[PDB]
């Protein structure tokens, strides 16, 4: 934080204050990324512990609401992404599909099939 | 975000991480020089306390310190993105640190293409040199000054000590 | 002049943040103003985290950092065979500097498979016990392990003395050039030691790379790598080298410490992890080479002194797993006076047979096994009470044989002597005698042959190996001699 | 001086002066001498005290055939 | 895209790319290091700087140097021509006979194959060696970790298995000598060469060798793991093969990860670890499987640091396994090879079902007796004997016979042992111990049972040991 | 030149010296120091700031305060005039007897002499204590580390050592009270006076006392050793001396270092112990030697940290120990002053290859016999000597004579021994025990050997009885 | 004013007053807070004074003027606290009213 955006690129436009103006608030640009931790610049307005959504599609979640960026645990890859990637808010924390059709079902923790029984139906989703 | 642009000197960043912003920023839009001079100005425009010393006084609210130190005053003609970066160093307290950014900067369009080799006495004296040709000698001739024993010495310049140094 | 120079950006703790010289060739040993070299390990952008060769007391900041523009090499040559140097291959001998003025990157690597060639070698120690039970071939990295100059060090001497026979012989493989990397070993220790080696004049075929108990840590650290570079020279130049690293325990210490001071952590046992790589990188470069390398060798005798027999001890575990065996010495036995003192149970060459000498093997091979049992019943059985004569004998005999694996320090042997005295026990002759007399026997036994059965010795020597015939002559010797030996 | 051999000269004529004093080169002076006096004496302690400028002679005898 | 190496702090190579960063993991070719210096993008450090990793070492680098993205992660030669070869990560001839000319290339990455695409429940691969199968029967295509302190004949033992088994096995095998002594690998090579299974006349063999020796800079050792995987996967699925995957040593691998963890600017862990150990492994081990397309029975040698298992890394390790061979340092220390702690070497995969109950039971009784038997051992150890129960004596002794009976010498390595004592086909195994259970043998010796094979012969040896 | 207090975080005084930063090890005397507070440059942190160490106390560290480079490390008297005198670390009468002047003062960083410059081959300093020399051969220039039961006339003995050795040998003495109890040193003071080993009347004592007691800050406590060394080298080389360097108690060194390390942003490695532990140790150890002229023989009170010696620190120490001393209550209890249990009085360098075989053997015979006799102490404890034969009787008796014979009376603790002490040259000493071994004096009184230095006075004494 | 004999409480965590100023401060001077409350200035950092607060953070808030007293503590001494239960200012808690000790000693 104290280096990034004190240094150029990132900084280099904030100066002007022209850089979406800034936004990245319901968006983020991945401030730094490595290793499933998307420090995502922006997303600024955020909820707490929001599940956010990736330019790699993917989710990560904005647990760490930092004043600059979002510590986003990206729940997966880094070989997709390369920096600055756009993260779009979802405005929303996780709730998970719940239902009774999961009875009879193996899902991943996403509450999505892995069962290879095709997909499950998601009736409810629930916090 | 942007893409890397760095006037000759150029620098290392770091308290010049800003410098480098403007080593891309100023550079781009090529008010490179506008600001290049701005900075110079700023330096002493800076240097006196006031609404600046304000910061020191922790208890002065940075929030409005920017709106005072930079509102009326540092925008006196320091503005483009220049007040905004003022207002950034401002936030980012890099104001006491700013001189060094200028230092760092200022070797920039001129001194951007400086003169380096570390050379006895008042050594190099950041200018410009073209590495294919010698430029060295010339300089030396110009002067028959500096101090070279007190200033850099016959030990460097020609080993006064070395003969001692073998034993 | 100061043309391209850099300023010590900061200094404290012997870690010189160096500003400038920026385009430093990696792991360049650079030179500071202070004479002192450092090597620019760490390229941070804005500075160089510089490991300082020499020490920070001297230092003052902003000081000129000069490239030395040289990547760490150490002098290589052979004129060091006959010399004591510091790790940088600069003397400390004070004879003036070594004729070896070639330099060689210590930054080198362990050859490949095809370059290498496996062992089938013997490699003689003159320490009977050793070549027999932990039979040695050339090229091998093997752990010398023992607890606080428990004669540990002594061992190295007897072997070296044994290589005397080769370098003073003419050996084309057994001419083992000794590289003694002395790690941490106080100046007194070394000074002392050296004094002996020189006396052993073995110094002539011997390099001593010297990190005493004075060094800057990287220096101590470095010393083996220095050695490492050099020994491979011989090895690869067909010449057959022996390196004694004594000990990595200290090196590691320095190194970890070095990391730590570098505020780089470690792992396990406070030791960083790729100290494994350290030893590997160091030790893998000791090898038995194919012919492309003149076949040669760098036989590595790392020494680790167990700390309290502890080896589970991560770094020991490491070294152990690298070494193809260990010679653990039973220090209490040492202390019992037993010199050698061995913990032969804890002395292994997993290898075994590629590393042995037939002369000996003929009595010893067989013996080792037989002893396996004697020893086994020395330990297994353990009461007051007697068993049978066999075993009782085995104990008695065994015990006799135990004396035989001793060797009052600094007294190695050529193969026939060893085999000779061994024949006496194996082949039943001195089960008879007692330890008190074993030792005596041997003395006599040697002077007897020395005088007389020089023939035979001649033979054994010749074949490098025993003959039944020689045996028959032996048979006579022992019996008769034995008779002479008492009466 | 750095026509560099003039720094050898710089030294050298002060060798020339010193060696072209007495003892060859002196000015080391008595303080050197007490230092000498110890180690030169101390040498003798290791080393015996007699014919260090003449030849030592020796003697040859027996006790008994015990 | 290009970067210039901006910071080298060891083989953690910081490259600041001056423009576009390809995603993390791109293998980069350093412009200059002809010492084919692949940097693998590790992090996008931010502001077009990546942390990349040299696989390699670094001396001589000018801080400056230009790096050109190899534009992908590692591409490696794959296919059968890697059989009978020594490949490193990049599949270079450490055969040193020139290339490993393939068709196929690979990202050394590969991921976990679908769960459904796996086979769900496997079927026993018997392990031959009596003690071994008996107590730990394996699954065809199984992942077995052999915990054991390396080099205790540990390594020997695996080889011996290979000898028995890998020989006995047809299919193909993948051999990864990671981090192990190049020296041993050298011998081994020649030994295979010799064996001609490392065909000196087939580019192939039936076995591919992949090496990531200790003396290497870490990345190389680290990554050879993915490589080896890629190949074996190649063979498993593609060649449909029953692959055998030998790994020595995952420990060095794990260690390699951990070592970097710090340097990687991450936190190390407890004991220094890679805190990502689990994810690394989970994903990796899940890269491993026996799917339908083929099966990889993977015999993974595990150096266990200071044999500490407790030691979190091994603690983790266990998850990955489904067969563990836990070697008893003590037993090994008794010279006794077999040396295993078999009440620690486990498979739930032993069964009254699958392994039939006989075996199974015979084992349960065994496991039991022994398990009880240890418990005392200590007490009695100092607490001597008799003012006690001697039925216990019977078990003790028996346990001991059995104990010895597990032992089989290193058949082949007469150099190490001088001894042979064979392999026991399974019924004979069950029989063997069962007979001891029948305890008829019991007036007999103890080392008769030691270092042998078929109980018949052991018995024969018993008699013989009885003079 | 000047420094500013720029930061005080305790005695890590961040000083900005701005007229360059004099090399680390330079002593500065801080200006504005009523309490003359020396700071040693430790790091040049940059910013013309150094991290420095108070080796003294603080307060009134009115910021920016002026600090003066002494241009050198701390300078302290060197030269003979220190004998009989107690100085603090900073070389100043804590004898409180006005100036402990010397002639020369020395900046006290001065380290690790070249291996060639030693007479690389070292030699026993003859103590004359039969037992001492015998069991642990004491080397000129060597480090002998004194593990030992508390207050047992450790000191008494020690005083006596000064008497026999520092007197009879050309031995001088340094007492470095490193982190010691000021009080015990006080007590001791009086004891020394009393013992006469120190003398005031004339200060021509063999010992200069340097104390850098618990009172010191670690840097000071730590450093009183180099200081002490600095003198001892002075005497050693310059006064050619066999200096006896009582470094009392080294543990306090270790302790001092270790403490600072952390704070010092140094990882104080295992057990807390300063990662440099060894190096500290080493650099220091290399200063302890028979050079050419003179030896600095270090008589090291060694507190047994955690009674643990695998204890990395001691492990290191082992390297530094040629001869190891544990003083033993067991022995003491036997009324034997020396209280030495001899089995713990060894030199690693024991051997017949090294500590040569009569000595060794006689000894071997002795350790063995005495032990064997000790085996008999258990055996006899049951069976009685009646059930053992005369070689046992003999051994017992001899052992016992020997036992007594290790007892040598003391001028000092006439209270412990019962009387005035002696001195025993080695030939006579070994001969003495060898003689007892020959059983010569039958078993004519054995209590005769009690508190007699030379063996003869006991033989004679046996007679006065008999 | 002063960032010399006064300081503004640079930060207050909770009872650690990093105090801006006071820069002439003695080592170990007890200071007095603008809340009366004393603290003692142990670490003279250039940037703050780490001051151990002899009080609580619910009792004040930052920027607060911390004034030097200029004193390192001494506590009353004499020899008539003999009876007393005191607070460690060498001043009561006995609630006898004061102490007997009116000399103070370091």
Q: Let me know: does F172 contact F235? Beta carbons within 8 Å.
A: yes
CA-based nearest distance G27→chain F, Å: 4
Contacts of B158 in chain D (CB under 8 A): 2
Contacts of D39 in chain F (CB under 8 A): 292-293
CATH number of C1-70: 2.40.30.20
Other C-beta atoms lying within 10 Å of the C-beta of residue C272: 26
Q: Which residues contact E365 (CB under 8 A, 6 or more apart)?
A: E437
DSSP summary character for residue E27: E
Cα–Cα distance list, C480 to C420, C437, C448, C466, C487 (Å): 14, 16, 11, 19, 10
Last residue of a domain, one of F12, F44, F73: F73
Dihedral sign, Cα of residue E416, residue E419, residue E425, residue E430:
negative
Q: Which CATH superfamily is domain C71-356 in?
A: P-loop containing nucleotide triphosphate hydrolases (3.40.50.300)
CATH number, domain of G43, equals 2.40.30.20
d(CA F172, CA F166) in angstroms, rounded, equals: 5
Burial E183-219 (b: 16+ CB within 10 A, else e): bbbbbbbbbbbebebbbeeebbbbbbbbbbbbbbbbb
Q: Let me know: does B84 contact B35? Beta carbons within 8 Å.
A: no
Burial of D59 (0-12, 13-18, 19+ CB in 10 A): exposed
Do E147 and E93 share a domain, yes or no? Answer: yes
Residue F188 structural domain: 74-349
DSSP summary character for residue F165: I
Burial of A103 (0-12, 13-18, 19+ CB in 10 A): exposed
Residue G58 structural domain: 2-71
CA-based nearest distance G97→chain F, Å: 32
Write phi, then psi, for C474 (nearest 5 degrees).
Answer: -60, -45
Do F343 and F372 share a domain, yes or no? Answer: no
Range C357-487 classified under CATH 3.20.20.450:
no
Nearest CA among C126, C185, C158, C143 for reference residue C301: C143
Does D60 map to a domain?
Answer: no
Q: Which residues contact E393 (CB under 8 A, 6 or more apart)?
A: none
Contacts of F240 in chain D (CB under 8 A): 38, 42
CA-based nearest distance G9→chain B, Å: 9
Domains held by chain F: number: 3
Contact state of B120 with C2 under an 8 Å Cβ cutoff: yes
Cα D47–chain centre separation: 15
Contacts of C285 in chain E (CB under 8 A): 215
- The three-class DSSP label of residue B92 is coil
Residues 27-66 of A with CB under 8 A from E: 31-35, 39
CATH number, domain of F62, equals 2.40.10.170
Mutate to test the interface with G, among F3, F49, F62 (most CBs of G within 10 A): F62
Q: Let me know: does F11 contact F58? Beta carbons within 8 Å.
A: yes
Nearest CA among E209, E147, E138 for reference residue E173: E209
Annotated binding site of F for phosphate: 151-155
- The three-class DSSP label of residue E462 is helix
Do F326 and F389 share a domain, yes or no? Answer: no
Query: Which strand (E) or helix (H) includes residue C305?
Result: strand C297-305
Residues 401-440 of E with CB under 8 A from A: none
Closest residue, chain B, to E16 (C-alpha): B4
Do E252 and E375 share a domain, yes or no? Answer: no
DSSP line for C329-397:
--HHHHHHT-SS---STTEEESS-GGG--HHHHHHHHHHHHHHHHHHHHHHSS-SSS---HHHHHHHHH
Other C-beta atoms lying within 10 Å of the C-beta of residue C243: 31
Q: Tokens 């790392």 sit at which residue?
A: C302
Three-state secondary structure of A36-91: CEEEEEECCCCCCCEEEEECCEEEEEEEEECCCEEEEEECCCCCCCCCCCEEEEEE
Residues 394-433 of E with CB under 8 A from B: none
Closest residue, chain E, to C105 (C-alpha): E59
Residues 72-101 of C with CB under 8 A from F: 92-94
Neighbours of chain B (3+ CB pairs under 8 A): A, C, D, E, G
Q: Let me know: does F107 contact F69? Beta carbons within 8 Å.
A: no
d(CA E223, CA F112) in angstroms, rounded, equals: 46
Last residue of a domain, one of F349, F368, F388: F349
Touch between chain A and chain F (3+ CB pairs, < 8 Å)? no
CA-based nearest distance A70→chain E, Å: 14
Which structural technique was applied?
A: cryo-EM
Last residue of a domain, one of E315, E349, E383: E349
Do E67 and E82 share a domain, yes or no? Answer: no
Cα–Cα distance list, C130 to C152, C217, C350, C377, E220 (Å): 12, 33, 14, 21, 37
DSSP line for G15-64:
SEEEEEE-TTPPTTEEEEETTEEEEEEEEE-SS-EEEEEES-TTS--SS-
Residue B24 structural domain: 16-107
Do E281 and E136 share a domain, yes or no? Answer: yes
- The three-class DSSP label of residue E326 is strand
Query: How many cross-chain Cβ pairs, C to F, lie less than 8 Å apart?
Result: 130
- The three-class DSSP label of residue B129 is coil
Q: Let me know: does E35 contact E15? Beta carbons within 8 Å.
A: no
C388 vs B: CB within 8 A: no
Which two three-digit tokens encode residue G1? 């004013």
CA dihedral F278→F280→F282→F288, nearest 10 degrees, is -140
Do E169 and E79 share a domain, yes or no? Answer: yes
Which two three-digit tokens encode residue C298? 């760098």
Q: Tell me the catalytic residues of F.
A: 154, 180-181
Do E308 and E390 share a domain, yes or no? Answer: no
Other C-beta atoms lying within 10 Å of the C-beta of residue F378: 9
Contacts of G62 in chain B (CB under 8 A): 58-59
Do E80 and E184 share a domain, yes or no? Answer: yes
CATH number, domain of E452, equals 1.10.1140.10
Contacts of F7 in chain G (CB under 8 A): 43-46
Q: Where are the domains of chain C?
A: 1-70, 71-356, 357-487
A83 vs E: CB within 8 A: yes
Q: Tell me the catalytic residues of E.
A: 154, 180-181
Burial of C249 (0-12, 13-18, 19+ CB in 10 A): buried
Which two three-digit tokens encode residue C405? 């694996």
Which two three-digit tokens encode residue F126? 């003859």
Do F185 and F298 share a domain, yes or no? Answer: yes
Domains held by chain D: number: 1
CB-CB: which of A6, A15, A84 is closest to B25? A15
Cα–Cα distance list, E462 to A8, E425, E437 (Å): 83, 20, 16
Closest residue, chain A, to E279 (C-alpha): A76
Phi-psi region of F442 (alpha: psi -120 to 50; beta: other; left: phi over 0): left
Q: Tokens 């022994």 sit at which residue?
A: E370
Consult the annotation and say whether C402 binds a ligand: no
Do E301 and E397 share a domain, yes or no? Answer: no
Closest residue, chain D, to B155 (C-alpha): D2
CA-based nearest distance G80→chain F, Å: 29
Contact state of F46 with C337 under an 8 Å Cβ cutoff: no
Do E318 and E395 share a domain, yes or no? Answer: no
Q: Which value in Å is the resolution of this experimental model?
A: 7.4
CA-based nearest distance B3→chain E, Å: 7
Contacts of C410 in chain F (CB under 8 A): 353
Query: Which strand (E) or helix (H) includes residue E278?
Result: helix E277-285
d(CA F409, CA G79) in angstroms, rounded, equals: 50
């Amino acid at each position: 934080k104290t280096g990034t955006a004190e240094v150029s690129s990132i900084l280099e436009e904030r100066i002007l204050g022209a850089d979406t103006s800034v936004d990245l608030e319901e968006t983020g640009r991945v401030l730094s990324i490595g290793d499933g931790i998307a420090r995502v610049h922006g997303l600024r307005n955020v909820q707490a512990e929001e599940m956010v959504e990736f330019s790699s599609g993917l989710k990560g979640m904005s647990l760490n609401l930092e004043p600059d960026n979002v510590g986003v645990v990206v729940f997966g890859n880094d070989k997709l992404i390369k920096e600055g990637d756009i993260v779009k808010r979802t405005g929303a924390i996780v709730d998970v599909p719940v239902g009774e059709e999961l009875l009879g079902r193996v899902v991943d923790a996403l509450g999505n099939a892995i069962d290879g029984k095709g997909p499950i139906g998601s009736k409810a989703r629930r916090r | 975000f942007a893409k890397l642009v760095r006037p000759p000197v150029q620098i290392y960043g770091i308290e010049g991480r800003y410098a480098t912003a403007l080593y891309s920023a100023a550079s781009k839009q090529n008010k490179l020089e506008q600001v290049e001079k701005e900075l110079l100005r700023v330096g002493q425009i800076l240097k006196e306390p006031k609404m600046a010393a304000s910061l020191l006084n922790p208890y002065v609210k940075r929030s409005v310190k920017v709106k005072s130190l930079s509102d009326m005053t540092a925008k006196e003609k320091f503005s483009p993105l220049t007040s905004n970066l003022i207002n950034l160093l401002a936030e980012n307290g890099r104001l006491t640190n700013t001189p060094a950014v200028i230092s760092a900067f200022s070797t920039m369009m001129s001194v951007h293409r400086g003169e380096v080799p570390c050379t006895v006495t008042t050594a190099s004296a950041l200018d410009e040199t073209t590495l294919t040709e010698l430029k060295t000698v010339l300089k030396s001739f110009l002067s028959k000054g500096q101090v070279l024993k007190l200033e850099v010495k016959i030990d460097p310049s020609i080993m006064g000590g070395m003969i001692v140094r073998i034993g | 002049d100061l043309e391209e120079t850099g300023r010590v950006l900061s200094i404290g703790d012997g870690i010189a943040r160096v500003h400038g010289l920026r385009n430093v060739q990696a792991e360049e040993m650079v030179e500071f103003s202070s004479g002192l070299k450092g090597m620019s390990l760490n390229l941070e952008p804005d500075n160089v985290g510089v490991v300082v060769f020499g020490n920070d007391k001297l230092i003052k900041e902003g000081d000129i950092v000069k490239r030395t523009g040289a990547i760490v090499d150490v002098p290589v040559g052979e004129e060091l065979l006959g010399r004591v140097v510091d790790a940088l291959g600069n003397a400390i001998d004070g004879k003036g500097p070594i004729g070896s003025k070639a330099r060689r990157r210590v930054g080198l690597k362990a050859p490949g498979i095809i370059p290498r060639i496996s062992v089938r070698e013997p490699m003689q120690t003159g320490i009977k016990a050793v070549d027999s039970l932990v039979p040695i071939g050339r090229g091998q990295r093997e752990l010398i392990i023992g607890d606080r100059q428990t004669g540990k060090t002594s061992i190295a001497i007897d072997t070296i003395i044994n290589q005397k026979r080769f370098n003073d012989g003419t050996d084309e493989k057994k001419k083992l050039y000794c590289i003694y990397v002395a790690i941490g070993q106080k100046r007194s220790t070394v000074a002392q030691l050296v004094k002996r080696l020189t006396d052993a004049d073995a110094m002539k075929y011997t390099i001593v790379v010297s990190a005493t108990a004075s060094d800057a840590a990287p220096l101590q650290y470095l010393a083996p790598y220095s050695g490492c570079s050099m020994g491979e020279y011989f090895r690869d130049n067909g010449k057959h080298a022996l390196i004694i690293y004594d000990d990595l325990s200290k090196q590691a210490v320095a190194y970890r410490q070095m990391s730590l001071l570098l505020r780089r952590p470690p792992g396990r046992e406070a030791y960083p992890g790729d100290v494994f790589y350290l030893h590997s990188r160091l030790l893998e470069r000791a090898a038995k080479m194919n012919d492309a390398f003149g076949g040669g060798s760098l036989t590595a005798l790392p020494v680790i002194e167990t700390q309290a027999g502890d080896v589970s001890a991560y770094i020991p575990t490491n070294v152990i797993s690298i070494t193809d065996g260990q010679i653990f010495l039973e220090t209490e036995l040492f202390y019992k006076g037993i010199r050698p003192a061995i913990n032969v149970g804890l002395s292994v060459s997993r290898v075994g047979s590629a590393a042995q000498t037939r002369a000996m093997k003929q009595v010893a091979g067989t013996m080792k096994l037989e002893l396996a049992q004697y020893r086994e019943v020395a330990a297994f059985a353990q009461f007051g009470s007697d068993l049978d004569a066999a075993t009782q004998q085995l104990l008695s005999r065994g015990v006799r044989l135990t004396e035989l694996l001793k060797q009052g320090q600094y007294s190695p042997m050529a193969i026939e002597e060893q085999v000779a005295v061994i024949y006496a026990g194996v082949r039943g002759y001195l089960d008879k005698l007692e330890p008190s007399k074993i030792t005596k026997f041997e003395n006599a036994f040697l002077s007897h042959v020395i005088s007389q059965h020089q023939a035979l010795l001649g033979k054994i020597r010749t074949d490098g190996k025993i003959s039944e015939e020689s045996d028959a002559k032996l048979k006579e010797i022992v019996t008769n001699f034995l008779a002479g030996f008492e009466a | 001086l750095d026509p560099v051999q003039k720094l050898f000269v710089d030294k050298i004529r002060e060798y020339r002066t010193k060696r072209q004093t007495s003892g060859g080169p002196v000015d080391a002076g008595p303080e050197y001498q007490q230092d000498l006096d110890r180690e030169l004496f101390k040498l003798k302690q290791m080393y015996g005290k007699a014919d260090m400028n003449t030849f030592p002679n020796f003697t040859f005898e027996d006790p008994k055939f015990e | 895209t290009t970067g210039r190496i901006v910071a080298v702090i060891g083989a953690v190579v910081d490259v600041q790319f001056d423009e576009g960063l390809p995603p993390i993991l791109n293998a980069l070719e350093v412009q200059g290091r002809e010492t084919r210096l692949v940097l693998e993008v590790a992090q996008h450090l931010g502001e077009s700087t990546v942390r990349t990793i040299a696989m390699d070492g670094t001396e001589g680098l000018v801080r400056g140097q230009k790096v050109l993205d190899s534009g992908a992660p590692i591409r490696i030669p794959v296919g059968p021509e890697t059989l009978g070869r020594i490949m490193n990560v990049i599949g270079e001839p450490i055969d040193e006979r020139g290339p490993i000319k393939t068709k196929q290339f690979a990202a050394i990455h590969a991921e976990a194959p679908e769960f459904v695409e796996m086979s769900v429940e496997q079927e026993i691969l018997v392990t031959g060696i009596k003690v071994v199968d008996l107590l730990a029967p394996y699954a065809k295509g199984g992942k077995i970790g052999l915990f054991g302190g390396a080099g205790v004949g540990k390594t020997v033992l695996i080889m011996e298995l290979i000898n028995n088994v890998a020989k006995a096995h047809g299919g193909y095998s993948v051999f990864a000598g990671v981090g192990e002594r190049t020296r041993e690998g050298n011998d081994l090579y020649h030994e295979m060469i010799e064996s001609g299974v490392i065909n000196l006349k087939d580019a192939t063999s039936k076995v591919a060798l992949v090496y990531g020796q200790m003396n290497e800079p870490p990345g190389a050792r680290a990554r050879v793991a993915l490589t080896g995987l890629t190949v074996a996967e190649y063979f498993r699925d593609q060649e449909g093969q029953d692959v055998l995957l030998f790994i020595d040593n995952i420990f060095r691998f794990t260690q390699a990860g951990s070592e970097v963890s710090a340097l990687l600017g991450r936190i190390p862990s407890a004991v220094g670890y890679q805190p990502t150990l689990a994810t690394d492994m989970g994903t990796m081990q899940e890269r491993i499987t026996t799917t339908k397309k083929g099966s990889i029975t993977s015999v993974q040698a595990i150096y266990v640091p200071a044999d500490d298992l407790t030691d979190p890394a091994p603690a983790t390790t266990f998850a990955h396994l489904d067969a563990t061979t836990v070697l008893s340092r003590a037993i090994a220390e008794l010279g006794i090879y077999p040396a295993v702690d078999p009440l620690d070497s486990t498979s739930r995969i032993m069964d009254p079902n699958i392994v039939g109950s006989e075996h199974y039971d015979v084992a349960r009784g065994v496991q039991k007796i022994l398990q009880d038997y240890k418990s005392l051992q200590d007490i009695i150890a100092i607490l001597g004997m008799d003012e006690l129960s001697e039925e216990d004596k019977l078990t003790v002794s028996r346990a001991r016979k059995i104990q010895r009976f597990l032992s089989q010498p290193f058949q082949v390595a007469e150099v190490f042992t001088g001894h042979l004592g064979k392999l026991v086909p399974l019924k004979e195994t069950i029989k063997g111990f069962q007979q001891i259970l029948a305890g008829e043998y019991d007036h007999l010796p103890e080392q008769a049972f030691y270092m042998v094979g078929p109980i018949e012969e052991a018995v024969a040896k018993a008699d013989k040991l009885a003079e």
